[PDB]
Design a protein around this ligand. Structure first.
Ligand SMILES: *[C@@H]1O[C@H](CO)[C@@H](O[C@@H]2O[C@H](CO)[C@@H](O)[C@H](O)[C@H]2NC(C)=O)[C@H](O)[C@H]1NC(C)=O
Ligand SMILES: *[C@@H]1O[C@H](CO)[C@@H](O)[C@H](O)[C@H]1NC(C)=O
Lengths: 90, 33
């Protein structure tokens, strides 16, 4: 579970526990409009290639990125948020 | 979860019971296991 940057619990971090940096395949940062109402996302896979589309302004979405994994994705979670003052929809 | 796949999963008498199903590799994929 993830926490907020205003008033969190005692744990403050529950994503991973590994100390050493593991081998990765893709790690990037993107920017989005802060003064926005809704954020639209389109994730899918085809022939072992994972495609992702993102949009912050407007209803239609635009291409964001695409990578190669070689396997078949099975499950997905939401990582519930734990905060002290907060409304939150997904 | 816990478990017959006996005696072998390749030459099993009842393939509908063992969870290790027989599948083929598609396009742009690897051997599942
Ligand atoms: C993507 O941005 C995040 C911050 O939004 C970066 O994380 C920070 O990285 C710096 C430098 O490594 C650290 O000093 C901070 O402590 C990090 N903050 C957090 C919250 O982890 C991240 O490094 C960026 N990634 C890339 C590839 O640029
Ligand atoms: C963010 O959205 C607001 C209204 O939703 C708009 O006025 C502003 O120009 C947008 N900023 C960017 C950088 O898109």
């Amino acid at each position: 579970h993830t926490v907020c940057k205003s008033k969190g619990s005692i744990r403050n971090e529950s994503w991973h526990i590994d100390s050493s940096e593991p081998l990765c395949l893709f790690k990037k940062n993107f920017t989005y409009n802060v003064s926005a109402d809704w954020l639209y996302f389109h994730f899918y896979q085809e022939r072992g290639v994972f495609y992702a589309y993102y949009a912050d302004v407007g209803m239609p979405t635009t291409f964001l990125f695409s990578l190669y994994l070689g396997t078949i994705l099975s499950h997905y979670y939401v990582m519930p948020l734990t905060c002290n003052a907060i409304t939150l929809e997904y | 979860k816990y478990r017959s796949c006996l005696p072998d999963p390749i030459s099993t008498y009842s393939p509908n019971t063992c969870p290790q199903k027989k599948v083929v590799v598609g396009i742009g994929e690897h051997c599942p296991g």
